[model samples]
Each structure stands twice: as structure tokens, then as C-alpha cells.
Target chain A: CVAEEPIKKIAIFGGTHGNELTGVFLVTHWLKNGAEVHRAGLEVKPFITNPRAVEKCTRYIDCDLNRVFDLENLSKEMSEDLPYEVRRAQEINHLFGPKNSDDAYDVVFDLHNTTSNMGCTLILGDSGNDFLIQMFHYIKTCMAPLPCSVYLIEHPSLKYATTRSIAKYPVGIEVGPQPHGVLRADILDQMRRMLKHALDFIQRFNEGKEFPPCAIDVYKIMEKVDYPRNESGDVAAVIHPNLQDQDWKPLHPGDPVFVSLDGKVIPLGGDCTVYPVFVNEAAYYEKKEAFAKTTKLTLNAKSIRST
Target chain B: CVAEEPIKKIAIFGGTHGNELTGVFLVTHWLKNGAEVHRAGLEVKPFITNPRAVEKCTRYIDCDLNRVFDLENLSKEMSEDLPYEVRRAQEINHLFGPKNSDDAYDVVFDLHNTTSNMGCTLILGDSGNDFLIQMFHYIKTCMAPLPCSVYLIEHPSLKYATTRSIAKYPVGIEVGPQPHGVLRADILDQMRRMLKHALDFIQRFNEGKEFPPCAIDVYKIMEKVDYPRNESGDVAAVIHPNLQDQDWKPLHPGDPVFVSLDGKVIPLGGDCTVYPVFVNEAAYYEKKEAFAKTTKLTLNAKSIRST
Candidate 1:
């Protein structure tokens, strides 16, 4: 088994979804007031991932920056003619990445917010990576008494396109029920606390602390459920009151998922029981996702040897 | 006293703030399925106020359509060089308005949704108008047990710039806690019921039904409070958890209003208590208004004599 290597450099990326105020404000706050996030033996960098989008308080300037970080996109010859986000993506890759290489940042934590009721979610690309699994387990332990969840992307950085995918070890922190362009004190506190714990975990690991891994439950995204739309392409239904804000709950086959404008309740289709995450996410409306279906699996993570 | 004249033409305008999906959907629904809004002896027209903004699911294309309805903007010389919203406003005025004239639509109910926790609010430009006051009172009575509120802009259409300001009797219906670009079933239902009752009231008024004079409570917008900002104009604090969803609630001196990123609580400053509406409104962050303060007043409204 490969032993866990000490993390020398780490970066925190915010404003990837510019309207997500939690991350945007946190990065800005740290940039001005820095002492709190400083960890001994680690070069921690806090960055605003999308400055133009953040300045305008919009999700993106030309295109979604978070979704433009694929290898192909990053490898493309940079030009001013490219969309702002596409150009920004290459600039970010050149700064912190040349992703999938040892020269990239040791770890990257991308902060995000959702309009859905997904509370304190830690998203990672590869559940198979022992380093990430152990870190997630530690985070979950630290966030005890506060509901923190781990979501697996079921693929490696090669398949992931998010800002976090630009680093060696990619981690995404999402907390929510906060409206875009508005900050909630409670939500901000959760993000701040999570980041604090994440940094603490890295500091301890770099100090040669062994992480005794155990079985951990992880939600793997399987498919997306889109809202019912009329022929004119307008969403004709909204998440049912029963399902609204009901993220991480078991959605049975007969459970009501949506209610049509004319008051007809639509039920979940599949016969199998599945957990629904990102229910009624505001940004997902453009992507046609009412919510995403995830399968929960208990995986036995190997112990991490720091020595 | 001038007796109330029967409303012959009523127009319902929606998608004025395109991302406010409750109005966007309701207007689309009414346009596709019209019978629900049709009433006897009254011609009801449903209009999508800003189609381009609605298509893009943004607040507006060039400038805010809702704010561009000012007389000066509308009366400006028409030119293709003008912004999309400005041109649309002129077209709307030509169709239903030529505002402040007898040729204007009898009553225009402009539908809107707030990101604030303002529950079913009927916003009127003039509280002094007998017809509007009576209509608001009727709508409030109908929305009993559901908590409907009347918000008075305190000025007439000449000074107010909103889609509803173009009508003879301008009424703005706002419902809330919904995120921009997303719709909720409960919020949509509240908006639908309010519109139904508004149309019902018009029908009864046309049938010569007299509404008895009564005293009603109305919240008059007095001033605005901005979020604490840093030297670079970044928001330094968030709405205190206690005040996050406390719309229409009286905020007294010493009440926790905002919480700084460093965990410091900022209290309300004024000596006198005032009701806050549009608390933490998402769109108002750009406008720098964390919330608007209102003074609740009980005013005697005159009877509506339809004969």
C-alpha cells in the first residue's frame, strides 16, 4: 500500500460560483485578514477563482468557470479571443496546476454554496484514493454533532472538470440553503468551521500523525432528475413541499418528487430506493436537474501511514 | 367623495424581474391556460413584462425593467440605440398605459417574488388612493389566516418606477423566501390565490358590490439600511441569524441586525423600533440595502361605492 505523503502546499479556491457568497466572502476575508488560516510548515494560498464573475456578482462572465477545467480545455492554446472563463481556466491551471502532475498544488479545497438544503457537504472526485478517504473521515469526525456529508464523484481528476480537479488531491466543500448573492451568518460559520478543521487535519497529517481509517458511508452521484417542463421548455413543476429541502433522505419509488403548476403531484420513477442530493438547486435549473440521485455505499478505507 | 368607477380592463404583468420564477411561471401558465383568470364583464390581459430578461433568466437585459418604468425614461424619444428594457417599457406603456391618463388600464396587478421572507405582500404606490386602499383591504381580508401585508410606497406613480405604476390602480403582489431563478409550490400557490382574489374583487366591484369603509394597517417604507462593508466595498457582515428571515417584524434598538465575519454582532442603531421588510433581499445587495425600514400606520379607508 502507498503511504500518505506530507502535504507541503495547499490552496483554497473561492468564488467559482461567484454568487455563492459564503466562499466569495471567506476568500476575500482571508485575503485582507490572513493570520487565522496560517498553518505551520504549509504554504496556504487563498484565491478568488473567478474575479470578473465575483466583481459582477454573477455565476460567470462568459461561461461557467468551474466546468471549464477539463484537461482538453486547459491544454488548448490560450487566446484573448476565448471566453473569459475559458481564458481564466488556463490562467488558473498555469498558476496552481499543470494538473495531475506532482508539481501541482499538494491539495486544493474549492468552496461552494447551493440553494438546496444540502448541509455541509464535502465532495471529492475519487473514493478509491486512500488519502482523500482518510481526510474525509477525519473531517466527518471533526464535524460531529453537526451534519457533514461526504459525496463521491466516482471518478478521478481526469474525468472531473471543477476547479478542485486542478490539484493533486481535490476536495470540494459545499454548504447550503443560502440564496445566491446573499450571505447567511449561520452558513458562513459552517464553511469557516469546516475550513478550519480541514486545515487542522492537514497540519496534523504533515506532522506525521497516523490516520486509522475505518468503514465510512459515502454518497455516489448516479443520475440527475430534471424538473417537468412544458412543451415551450418552461418548468411546469416545482419540487414538492414534501421533498423541498429534503436532501440526503431516502427517496422511495412512491415518494412525491414534484408538483405541477396545475397541482398534480409527480412521484419518483425507479423501483429502487435512492438518496436524493441537491434537491431543487437554483443553479441546476439551467442544467435541467431538479435534483441528483445518489447511491450510499459503506467503503472500508485503508489506514494512512504518515511516517 | 368620488364614487368608485367599475374596472373595465385589468392587466396582470409578470416576469418583470425575470429570475423571480413565481411570476414568470404564473404568467406563462395563464398565457397557455387562460380560463382560470377570465372573469365575467371584465377583460383580463396577462403580459410577460420583460421577455428577453425572462428568456435569459436574469433580472434584466440592459437595465432593470422594473426601475426603468419612470415617466422620464418612458417619455424619452424612442430609438433602437436604447437598452432592451427601456424599449420594452415604452412598448408596455403604449399597450396598457400611456400612464397617468384615462386611457390607461383600469387596474394593473404586477406580480413579483422576493428573496426576503416577506409573505404575501400587496405593494401600492399610493396609500392615499381610495380605490387602491379598498382593493388592498379586500385582498388582505381574503388572504386571512395566511398573513398578507400591505406595503405603501408613500408616493404616486409619477415618482414611483414599477410596472404596476402604469395603471389607474397599481397593485404589486410580492411573495417570498424563494430564491431567484427557482420557484416553490407553496410560494406559487400563495401568489396564485392572491391574484385570484384580486380578480374576484374586481369582478364583484364591476357587479356594483360596495366595500364598507374600514381602518387597516399599512407599512410605509421610510428608509433603507445597508450591510456593513469593508474599505474595498465588500460586505463585511451578514444578516444576523435572528434577523435573517424576520421580515415585517419590528426591529428594536439593541436588536442583533448583522454579524461580522470575525463573530462580532452589530445591533440596530435607531432609538425607535421600525418594522423591516425585504430583510436580506438577494437583489438588493447590489443596491446596498440589507433591508428597508417601514413604519406601520393605521389609516381609515373610505367605502367603495360602485354605483
Candidate 2:
């Protein structure tokens, strides 16, 4: 029988977006082999998002599951068309209720692979949460061996308001692309290394094991990409630069970011570097009012003490 | 404002093993939109299962997340070397404490998609729950454009156990796979329709609406798969005719299904069509003891009843 305490509760998931499949692969590998290390206390929950889309290799099966996270949709038994994803959210929330255990998780990692070449980025929800920030730094510096950037989403407007917000702390991790066809091996190797580093960090933190300590870099959300139209019809075009590295120093104000209408590459005017840029035409138009064009630049100003 | 009701509710998910992504996506989508619906009256929670394998683009992540519903591994936490899928089952139970809600959902539909190139399919959890059965028919006939297959899973070993016990009337819908990648659209459409159907059915049942008459098909779980491993740590294989078409007859006893060597495939002895063939290697080995490679052939006898 499995022991009851000292359980390392970790919630890992992938494919929130139908196209990103690398996170799924990494989580699967761990599930198949991770039990060989310690038999008793570690617990892991991996949730697969967008099953219908995953089967069809589409973004969603009925509706965009990601957008169906409002409380109103789940209340009424009848109304306008409610996506199956909404009911799914209800099921998942019910599953993750407080009854799981009085013991809180040592860490929570929401695994995701980016659609664009944004390198490796860590999107943190609560910048004020010291433990989470420390964890992020530890992951970026001591854990992962990849080029990484930390984005603190501080937009009051975009901040999610809910008891079950994803930004609670150590919440989001976008691990590049799937590297499917040609870059498959490279992507796989990177995923393995990153996963290992994360596990090692957890073990060292929990078991008091010795490991190298490193400094952390922090970035703040400065701006978002704005479109020409309120709702970019199917013909709307989004222009942005290719985010290739984690060097926050190279990105300065007035640097050319992307080309707007009339084929003109706009320059960054404010302080911060570009954050989660929307490349999909649907997403660009769906959330057009909340963002700006090329002027959305986030800044990396200061660092805090490590945990 | 949404009316708040205090009641323990149960939500089902991950009915279609291959369409695991749909549950996760649907839940996330609902969480976003449910809030709006809730204003009309209803409180809902959500969860996601088999996230790891979904990210990998395979049917099962490491192991079949569905198979682990028994909540056998209760103490394990999410870890690098653990079967993340199993952990999800345990975590889900923990999240949704052991108490029953006073005002719970009358019924639940475990969202799923199909691999059969055929239309949609529905697996009803309870064959006797008249209200739920009526709701199922309403969904099958009104909500979706796909054909429906309603059956019961009554295996002595796989009976209504603690963790595996689904809703009184759990329904599994397998929507057809579209090549154009519009699966998400279909799922969303069906999800909306199903919700409406459920609400209407509930209202009619409560308000004394005339019950629409329909035929119901019930089947029993006569056999399961057995995964035998050789001394060299190789899995034995079993091969038989693919059971993708509905016209194919169900499996019968003493039928030649398939053969196996230490990781080799063998044929069967009798005339029987298989269900849920473990084509994905990960699914074949998941909880092998619980699900062995055995064929279940049943007589196509039907007992019709009305509420």
C-alpha cells in the first residue's frame, strides 16, 4: 500500500491549445517511468485539454474550451449553445476540490507548448507571491538549462478574478514547440532535460539535497499587441518579430518589433519586451480591444531574494 | 444575479478514451463561460484527465487515465517518475470529497469522441434510471447529428466500485472525426445542444411534459483484455478483425480473437467483433491486471421497457 504523508502533489497538464503536444509527451514519459524512483508518496495529476480537437488535430471540438471558463455558463441547465468544454471545466473543478487533501501541493506546473517560436517562457500569475517567484527563479536558473524568460502579467484589466485562478503561483510554463517532424529529436531532448531539471529542483528543495544555487531574472508585462480592427475579420493580419532568445537586455525601446498595415515594421517605444504575442488570426480578433499594436513592451527591472 | 443553491453535485468526464482532450478543453471552456450562465442559477466545478497523453497526441498518456478510475493509488502525488495519469484519478477523488451533494446534478454526460469513422455514440451508465435514460435519448435524437449507441457496462469485476462508480446515468458520446479539423466546432455545437436538451428534459420531467418515446439498446461487458508480460520484459500481442463498423456483430464466447507470444500477436478462435482495441501501445499496458486481453461475446438479445 502507498504511504499517506510526505506526498509531493504535482498537477501537470498539456494541450490546453490543441496544437501544442510536446507537454503531453513529456508528461506521458514521466507517468510511464517515474514510479521506479520512490514508491510511496509522490502524486501527479496530468489533465489533457481539448480532447475533440486533439483527436482531429483541431483547436477545439465544439467551441474554444479555453474561453468557456466563466461561471455563468455552468449555472443554467439551458441557454444559448454552451460548449462541452464548459461542462468539462465544471467536472475538472469538481475533481480538484479541496477534499484531495488538507496538505497543499509543494508545487503546481501547468505545462504548455507555444505555437510561435517564443523560446522558453514562464508566465507567472502572482508576482507578489514570494514562494512562487522563488520557484520561478529556481526553475529558470538552477532547474532548466534552456534560454528562459519570466513574464509577470500585471495588467489589471486582464487579471482573472476567480477563486480558482490559474495565476495563483507556479502556474504556467510554455516549453517552446513540439519539434514534431525534423526538430523532433531536439525538442524531445530539451523537454527531457527541462523535466529532469524540474524534478531535481523539487527533490533538492524537499529532501534537503545539495544542488548549485543560481540568480533569477524577472520581467513585467508592459504591453500587448493591438490590431487595426476591433475584431480582426478573417482578413486581419497580425505583425510581430520572431522572439528567439531570453536576452532581455537586447530588447530596448524604439526597436523594430513588427510590421503593421501598409507593410511597415513598427518599433518598440516603451520599456518592456514583448510577452505572449497572439499569432492566430482568431485569437488576434477575439481579444483585440484588450491589447495594443506593436507598442506592448514589457520591462525587466529588478530581482528579489531567492527562496 | 444567479441563484445560489447548496447541493453536492457530480460531473462526469473522459468517456471516450481517445477523446480525452475534449473533457479538459470543455471544462476550461465552461469555467470561462459558466459564470455567465450561473447568473441564471447553478454552481459548477471542473477537472481534466489524461492531460499528459493528450499533449503527446496519443490516445492514452502513459496509461489509460480512464482505467485508473478505481482510485487504487491514493497516496501518490504528481512526480517526474510517476504515472501521472493514475495520480489524476486519485487527485480527482480527493478534490471532490466523499460527501454527496444535497442539490447535485440529476445526471451527467462523460464527454467523448469516437475513432470509428462512424457517427456519434453514447454509453449510458445506468440502464434503469428512467429520467436519465430519457435525457440520453433526447440528446441522441435532438442535440447531435450523429447516430447513438447506448449500452451498459456490467462486468462482475468492473461493477460499480468506489472510484469507478460513475453517475446514475453516465453517458459517453463519441462524435465522428472530421478530416477538415472542425472537430472542436462539432463538439462545441453538440455540447451546447446537449446542455439545452438536458435542461429541457429536466424541466419537462419536473413540469410534466409528455415523454417522447424512443428505443433503448443495452449491452453487457462480457470480456476484457489481459496484458501478459514475458520474463524478458516484453508484452504479448493479440490481433483480430477491427470492429469499427456498427453492422459488425458483437463478440461471442469461444471465438478465435487473437494469439500472443512474448510480445507477439496471435488470432482468436470464435466469431466476435472487438470493442476498444488497444491500438495505442500505452493503453495496452495500462492497469493490465484490471483489464486483460479477453474477448466478450454476448447474444444480441434486447429487453425493451418504458417509463
Candidate 3:
């Protein structure tokens, strides 16, 4: 019966993964023109998730920065008690903490660029949030040529390992196939569009705007498949040319997914037509992943109320 | 004099500094259908210059790999005797060095991407080397709408530290405005063109073809100018919008090159006009370089010998 709290502020982060360069470069460019971002009733926190990694031209120094936001790490007693990124995570948590406090930022967006073939993906942390669901719905139905897909990687008991996990209302803006350490103008523009529209939505929410209710099919990550490797634990195959950059498409049985070093074609080898995400991700090699499989599910928004 | 050793083998490298991912991605992608790189009598060693840095997505794990080619470090006793990179550099030397050995690769191309405003630059370790001059000459004369320039950072009395400097003949493909750890297809294509042509030129020289003599303007690095700094040595100004991305362009006295935080414009102070290179390079922040100044000089193909 009580009116929902207004979405008064948003925290926008870039370089959460140091190898994701678009956000890092764009943040620098955006902060220089800070006046343009001053919308009424909204405070924007422009942050670089990791400075050392960006300075060194890397993804992270000690461990992945995005995966260090859990409560255990954020409550560290001393900076020296944790690794480089863990210490930084605690610092951000301290400043941005009391997570659900009325004065705290209502939503957070961690900008990222991927080596995956995924075109434009807006990732949600939880499936049951209707406001975020309808937000994706509005983008899907109202926007011209909605080239974006929604990805949710959470379940009832699983803890998230992403920068967005820190926020009560968090989302990820992922666009890519741009290699890990390069910037493209088109991608930059795409990100700009998303950021502006997100802010526009926040301002409208602050003004108590109604959300569009619709069923959205979210790409939920299923399982990861590593590159085919020989008995030596060395990768023996790479993403097949046919499957390279096929991020959102249904990977069918008998589809060529990898090509071995000795010139052999490896197939998907399954009957289910599950969609694949993060195909040939540059960041996943360390995790030994060629790609993660995802299944699409349709969900109806339960409430159209503004966040 | 005995005929200069024929360039029968060539070493092509990427991700030497790790954060420069364009070459890394380009090389990885190109190596897929790699039979296309076949030029008879040329054995191509498709190598990732620094696997650990590339894997970690940083510039280097220990010291800068690109600068570790100094002879003093290469003679270290063991991997522990030096940083992680020095050990790898020694391994590379053992496999590909004794610079002029018949078994060693004749010419090495450590492909790189940059955040500098530089676009399609071919960097030579020693400008005094006539083959490289002729190669640049050939590109300028025959290629319509040449989308590349030449940058030489060398002196006869000095020993170069770059990977290119390790070979009997070494050159670098430097393209940019692509930020570190990101990739762009256009930049990738540009790099591909340079790589292909570099190999083509090497092949021609091996087959004893005469390079069409022409004058080529090479942008030679001069001194570095940091962004305007306050008393604390903290950067007090950003790169002025007028001078941003104006790499290889004339930067004249009285032209605005930096802008203070509180909205003050700073001008280039000297009387002479100098062409700027590496303008706003991301990696140069550690070195406090806003840009590297350069002067353009025209050189004719006076020597067309083998690599």
C-alpha cells in the first residue's frame, strides 16, 4: 500500500573488467562533459572499477574485479587483508553501501565490452524483478529495432559473481565481438545510446511513469563448454569458423563448434537447440571456456509499477 | 660483401604487451585459415609475443616485454635471474635469435595496437636499414590512398629494446586510437593489410626483385610532453579538444594543446611547428606522456638489399 521509493541516483561503472575498454574510455570522455549528465533528481557516480588494471592494460591485477563483490570480500578489515581488487571492492562497497538505504543509488550499471559475438545484451541479476523486466520490455517493444537481448544468470540459491551483484537493482550493459583491448566508434555510440536511455528511464521513474507490461524471453546461461583439449590438458581446438560470433543463435546438433589443431571439426554433439552465449570470449580462456550455453524462457511481468 | 641472408623465414607476433589486443585477436583469427599466409620459401612462425601477459590481459606480468630485448638482460643466467619476461625473451632468443643465424628468423614483426592517435603506422627499429626504407617506399609509390605511415625509433649507436630489435631485420605494425584491451574490425583489417604487405615485401626481396624507389616521409619520435601538471605533479589539464587525436598533424605554437580542469586553455609554447605522434596514448599515462612529439623527414630508397 506504500508508494515505492523514487529511483533518485544511479552508479555507472566502467572497466570493472580492465580488458573491457569501451566503458573505461567512454567514462573518461563522459566525465569531461559532466554538465550534460546532470538530470534533475539524479546523481551519477562515474567510476573506474579498477585503475591499476586499466593502467597496465589488463583485465585485473590479482583476481577478476567483477567477481569480488560478495559480502565476505566487501567486509574486509584491512586493505592489506585482501588482494588488490578485493581491497578496491571493499572501498567501493563502503562508499556505495548500506545497499538498500533510501539515500543510496537506486540502480547500478556496470558497463562491459566482450569478445563474444553477442550484439547487445542487457543482463539482469534476478529473474523475479518485474520493474527491471518491464524496463527490458519497454526497450524491446518501443525502441526502434530492439537489437538487445536480456540475460539472467541467477537462480534461487546461486550467488552472483559480477559487478552488478552489489546493487539492489543492478544491470549489465554488454556489447561486443570487439577484441579485449580495442575501441570501436560504433560500439561506443551503441553504449552511449544505452546509457542515455537508461538515464532517461531513471528520470521518468523518478517522475512516477508507468512501465510497459510484457512477456520477455530472457537468455539464461546453462553450462559452459571448454575448448576441446588433448590429454595434456592443452586446448586442442578453437571455435569453428561457422560458430564464431554466433552468440544468440540456436546451436543445433551436428553443428561445427570447434576445429582441432590437427585439422579436425568438432560438433556440438547434442540434440537440444540451446542458444550459446559468449562464444569465443577472450576473457574466458583463463576459465577454460569456449562458450556458455543458454536457454531462452518467456516471462510475464507481474507489476508495471516504477522502481 | 656476402649476400645479405635471405629472409626465408619470418616471425609474426601479437599481444607482445598483452593490453594491445587488436594484434592478438587478429593474429589468432588469421591463424585459423592460416594456409593463406603461405608464401613459398617463407616459414611463418605465428607467435604470441607474451602469452602470460596476453592471458592475464595486461601489458606485462613482470617488466615490459617489448623493452626487455636489451642485450644486458638477455644474457641473464636464468628465468629467476630476471623478471618473467626476460626469461621468455631468452627462450625466444634461443629459438629465433643469434640474430643473423641462417636458422633464425630473418625479419620479425611484432604486431601492436595503440591508443595513440597514430593510424596505420609501420615502425622500424633502425631507419638506417635500407630494406625497410625501400619497403616503405614501395608501399607509398604503388598503394593508392596509402592508409599508413612509418615511425622509426632508432639510432645506430643504440641497442633497441623492442621485439623487432631482436631480429636481423625488425619492424612493427602500429595502428591506433583503438584503446588497449579492445578490438575493432576496421583496425584489425588495417593491421592485416600491413602484415600481408610486410610479408609480400619480404618475399620480393628474397626473390631479388628491385623495389621501386620513392621518397617516404617517416614520423620520427622526438621528445615527450606531459599534460600540464600542478605543483604536486598531478595532471592539471586534459588534452585540449582541438589537439585530441591530431596524431601526425602539425602542432604549431599558439595552438591549444591542453585545457585546465577549471576551464583554462593552454597553448603549445615553442616557436617551431612539430608533428605530434602517440597523442593521448593510454599506456603513456604511467610515463606521464600526453603525447610524443615528432618531426617528419623524407627519405629515398637508397638501399634495396635483403633483410
Candidate 4:
């Protein structure tokens, strides 16, 4: 149903995780060279979501900016006592979104980089939105030969706390294998190509182009698997060599998932097959998540109506 | 000259840069299981040098603890207003050092991890010391086909600010290709093997074993190469794919070192060839160093006299 609406104001946010250098550089680059992101009849705004975090080249000052966008924190009264990120989230919400409002940006693309081996990933909070689904299909078809995965978070758009949840159509673009606080030439180029194709899709859509229905493959996050811990609550195992950089790869039952400090292999517990993602993510170690398990789903996207 | 004294008290320090998880985990493991690091005639002390930084899983709190051990900071009066690392350095100096005095620990092994591709590197501040050169030779020979490199910092021991510089014989063991906040099973095992061999060498020396003079290969750091930056002081280029993961490898004149944003190759400027180390180190982005240039030196080390 959202495909009937034209995307006039689109926002591209970078530096949500400041240490992820690719997004920071891309946003900084576009800020100075605005002509690169300009498209006719569509307002494309590029922004550094956490300017202070980008300046420090740190993940965040007090807490993660990407995780502080819940309605509870966004609607709360502003005070200096609040964490720096919480205040910044509220400011961002005021500038672009009030959450589920008609005046909000039509689409929001939040760019990110992972230390994990995820190549190029498109994460969507809501699977029911036709516009997002069509956009994913368009980008996927455009990125032929070069692989990319679409990940659905299985949460309502408004209920999600991520930065992309601000808009009706939310797209989280993540690319990596690149380390945090370092930039990779290949990874940056991949992210740029994905962004370029996405903007082109929106420009054509606004010009009354029609998109046919298509079968799209998606990976929906099921649950997170944590590293085995010892009695002292310290992680006693690490991601096994077999699964180290195998993101989005099929992980069957009894596959070795972790290797203990004593050189013992720990297998996957589930009986069913699943795809593992965010394998050995550097940022998730503190979060206690070793990797995430996702179930692959092939769904049919509805046809888009032209003006 | 340091070879005359017996290494009676050996100190192993870890977590100096907190986010380097391999060192932190190794120290924690040794603390609980002391027998692994114990020797017959030597006092071995394994310690977590920066507890607060380790707990928070960050590089450091106020400043880098590794860089605060200069004599100016060690001798300075501790005040509540001083940076946390400076205060901590003074505390560490009092506990094991006074720095250049005879009462300092006989030897110090400071463990570290880099996000760069440098693997199993031994960093020595004072190349003139026969004891350190012998230790490097012993470890390199013992490591065999696993391959390790000795990197001389080209600075006087007491004048250097690193944690290892607090002792009479300073040894800085840095291993990598491991990300800052994540631990790799292979990297951890590599660190464990290197430490085991090092401790074995000390034990053999304590038991009156003699080591003859030998030639050892060492890479002495000459200068650092920074990423090309635009007028705004933002990095305009990334590490070239050709140079990435080529640490300790020869880089010739006109070789590609960086790739500009517009896809132009930036070649190394000097006419002479040099070995590059710490290529694209994650933490060095803010430090303004893309990689360090080093000249390989094969030097002669004196024989150790038997008891």
C-alpha cells in the first residue's frame, strides 16, 4: 500500500556507529560534494547522525546512538542529566521524525559497517511494507553477481529502536569484514554502489515507473547464540575456525560453532538448519552475542502502481 | 651489559590497552591457574595492568596507559586532577619500578594486540642490550616454522613510555590481525605458544644453560606513512588492496600504498625499498599513521656466560 505514495524526502544517515569508518567517510564526502547525491524531484538529505561520536572516532560517548531511539527516550523531556546519545536521539527525532507521523521522511537509509564478515546486507524492520520489499527486490536484482542479503528484524517499524525506524520505509545498509576504526577500499566501494542503486530506484519511482511483482529471498533473524562462558561469567570459548568468516552461510545441525579454550569444539544445538550472520562481530562481544541465527524465507512482493 | 644479572623476578603485564582482549584473557587465565606460568628458580607475577579499562572493554579511560610511563609522568606527584593513566603510571612505578634502579623487576613482558596484520611481533625498545637480543633470538628460533618478527623501537628503555619500559629488561610482545575488541582462537593460541617459549627460555637461563652468539633479524622502525588527507584534514584515501595484509613484507618504490576516493592509486614516495609493518592498523587512524616503515637489520648478539 505504501508504494502508491511518492518518496519526496529521503534521508541517508551515517556515523550512527562512529567507529565504523566507511559510513562516516561517505557522509562526510557527500556533505561537501552535494551534487553527487542530488536527484531530480526527490530531496535526498545526507547526515552524520552522531557528529560528536564521529569527531571522537568512538562508537559513542555515553551509550550507542543507534539503540537509543525508542519512543520512551525520544518523547522524554530534554535535560543535561540524560546521556549524550539519548539527547541526540531526541534531537534527531525532532528533525526528521515524530515516529509514525505523516510528516516524517518517506524513507530512511541508515548506513553501517560490521567487523563481521557480512558482505552487503539490507535490514528491514517491517516485512509487510510493499515499498521496502520492492526496494529490496530492485536493489537485489541490480546487484547481480555481487551478493547481498536482505534481513528482516520481525518488529513493527514504530516499535523498533533503531535509527531507520524513523521513516515509513526503513533500510539498514550494512557492509563488512572491515575492522572497526579502519576503512577498506573495497568495502567502501561496495557500500557506495548499493547506495547509488537505491537512490536511482527512488528517483525512477518518483518519476512514475512501475515495478512488477517478484519472488524475493529474505533472512529473518530468529535468535542470537552466545559464546559459552565459564563460572566467573567470562567467555570461555571463541567462534570456531570453521564458522569464523562464514556469515550468511548454511549452518546445519551439529556443526562446530565454538572452540573452547581447552581446544574442544562446541556444536550447534538446534536440530534444524539455519543461516548464521554477524559471525564474530567485534561489537557484539560485550553484548554477549556470538552470532545470530536466521531463517531464510522466499516471499512474493506485490506489484507497484504507477502514477 | 644486562646479561650479567640473573632474571630472578619476572613480571608479565596485560590489559595495558584494555580492548586488546587476548592479553586481558591470558592474564585472567594465568591469575586463576598459576601453575602454568610457574618456574623452579624464578618469581613469576602475572598482572592486569589496567583493570578499569579492561572492565569497560575500551582502549583506556582518560589517556592511553601504555604511553603514560615516561619518567616525567612516573616521577610527577600524583594529584586528583591528573589524568587517570598518569596517576596509574605513578602507582605502577612505585609497585615495580622507580624505573632505572636495581630494585626494579629483573624483566617485564608486556602483552599487546594490534588490529593490523602484524603477527607474533617482539617489540624491543633498547636494541643495544645483549639480553633482549638473545631473548629475541631464542624465541624466534624456538618458534620455528610458525614465523615471528623482532621489531626494535629504536628508543632508550627508560626514556620510552611503554609499560615494558618500567623494568630493567623490557619485552613487548604484540600479536595480531585480531580486531581490538574481539578475540580469535588462533591468535590466542599463537600468543600462548610465544609466551610458553619465552618463559621456557627464562627457566633454562635460570638453570645455568648457556646460549652462544648468533645473528638475528630485526626490523627497526624508521618513519610512519599517513593516509592522504583532503584540505578539511579528513582522510581522502584508504589502504590499497595490494598493500593490505602485507605487514613485514617488502614495499618497493612506486608500489601502491593507498587508493584515493576517486579510485586513483597513491604510490610510495621514497626511491629505496623498505619493509612495511602495522599496515592499516585500526587504532592508528586517529594517530595519523597508516603504516610504519622499517629497515631490516641482521645483527650479532653476544653469548650468555654459564653459571
C-alpha RMSD over true interface residues, each candidate: 0.9, 13.1, 7.1, 1.1
Candidate 4's error at A256, in angstroms?
2.1
Q: For candidate 4, list the clashing residue pairs, or say none.
A: none
Output DockQ, candidate 1.
0.83
Q: List the candidate 4 regions with Cα displacement exceeding 4 Å.
A: A1-3, A156-159, B1-3, B157-159
Residue-wise C-alpha lDDT for candidate 4, range B86-159, written one tens digit per residue: 98888888888879898999888999999888889988777677777888888888888888998877755423
Q: What clash count does candidate 2 reach? A: 108
lDDT of each: 0.87, 0.45, 0.73, 0.86
**Candidate maximizing TM-score:** 1
DockQ of each: 0.83, 0.01, 0.11, 0.71
In each prediction, how many residue pairs overlap at the backbone (N, C-alpha, C within less than 3 A)?
A: 0, 108, 10, 0
List, residue by residue over B143-212, the lDDT tens digit for candidate 2.
4465554545545345433333434344455454321111233444445455556555554444444464
Error of model 3, residue A230, in angstroms: 4.1
Docking class of 4: medium
Clashing pairs in 1: none
Write model 4 residue lDDT over A221-261, tens digit each, in one string: 88889899998888998999899999988999899999976
Candidate with best DockQ: 1
What order do candidates take by DockQ, descending?
A: 1, 4, 3, 2
Q: Considering chain A alone, what is the TM-score of candidate 3?
A: 0.93
Question: Evaluated with lDDT, which candidate comes out highest?
Answer: 1
Query: What's the TM-score of candidate 4 when only chain A is evaluated?
Result: 0.97
